Amino acid sequence: GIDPFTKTSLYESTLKNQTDLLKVTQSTVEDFRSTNQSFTRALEKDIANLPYQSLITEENIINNVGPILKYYRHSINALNVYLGLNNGKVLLSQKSDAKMPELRDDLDIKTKDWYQEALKTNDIFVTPAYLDTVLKQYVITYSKAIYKDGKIIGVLGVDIPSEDLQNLVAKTPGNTFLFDQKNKIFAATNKELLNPSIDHSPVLNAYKLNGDNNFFSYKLNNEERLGACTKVFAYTACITESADIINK
C-alpha cells in the first residue's frame, strides 16, 4: 500500500515475523548442541566414576568402559562413541552386527583435532562437520578429556551425523538456512539452496553491513527481498523473503 503509514505497518509486522522465525532456527542449532553436550558430560561422569583399577589396563577398559559406550551410543543413536588413549589406541563402539567394542590401533588419533583440541581445553570440544573414517559419514564430533583425581584417562568422543542437524533445520518454519564456518551452505528449509553454485553473496554481503538480527533489503533479478542473519556458534543462520509483502 502506497500510504507510508500502511507500508510501515507491513514492514514492522514482517520484520517481527521473520525475526521470530530466524530465532526458531537459532534455537534449533542451540538445542542440538546443548543436548549433545549434556550427553557427553554424563558419559564423562560415568567413566570417571569407575575405580582406577577398571581404567588402568586395556582389557579392563574394554570390559568396563565398553558397555557404557555402547549403552550411551544406543540411547541417543550416535554413530560412534569412543575413548582414545595416550598409547594411540581407541576403544570404539560403532554402529553396525552387534559386535562388542574393540580396541583399535589404526585410527591415527593423535593427528585428529577431536583428540588434540580436547587436551587444550577443559570444555567439550565441538568439531566442524567432517568425514568420519570409521563409518564414512559426515559427523559432528563432541570430545572431552576425561580426568579422574587430576589424572587423564583419555579423550572421549561422540560422533553425531551432521545430517541430523541438517534435517532439524530443514523442518523449521520459514525460508531459513545455515552456513558453516567457511560460509558454505550447510542446511536449508528449501533444498534448492543447497546447490553449490547458488550465489549467496548478496545475503552474506548484506549481513556483513548490517550485523546480527538486523533486518535488511537486497536485490535478486532486480526484485526486492528482505532478510536477516545472525551468528550461531560458528554458523551463520539467515532468513529471506520477497519484499512483495511491503511493496504490493
Ligand X SMILES: CC(C)[C@H](N)C(=O)O
By the rule CB under 6 A, 82 interacts with ligand X: yes
Least distance in Å: CB of 191 to ligand X?
26
Q: How far is CA 154 from CA 51, 121, 123, in A?
A: 15, 14, 14
Contact call for residues 202 and 190 (beta carbons, < 8 A)? no
Single out the segment in contact with ligand X by CB under 6 A; choices: 130-138, 192-200, 202-210, 225-233.
130-138
By the rule CB under 6 A, 89 interacts with ligand X: no
Q: Which three cell numbers stand for residue 6?
A: 500502511
Query: 176-179 and 235-242 as β-strands: parallel, antiparallel, unpaired?
Result: antiparallel
Q: Binders of ligand X among 207-226, rule CB under 6 A? A: none
Single out the segment in contact with ligand X by CB under 6 A; choices: 131-139, 164-172, 205-213, 226-234.
131-139
DSSP conformational letter for 191:
G
Single out the segment in contact with ligand X by CB under 6 A; choices: 116-124, 128-136, 209-217, 235-243.
128-136
By the rule CB under 6 A, 80 interacts with ligand X: yes
Tell me, by CB under 6 A, how many residues bind ligand X.
11
Q: How far is CA 223 from CA 65, 123, 188, 209, 241, in A?
A: 59, 46, 22, 20, 11
By the rule CB under 6 A, 162 interacts with ligand X: no
Classified as helix, coil or strand, 58 is helix
The footprint of ligand X (CB under 6 A) covers 80, 82, 90, 107, 112, 132-134, 139, 141, 159
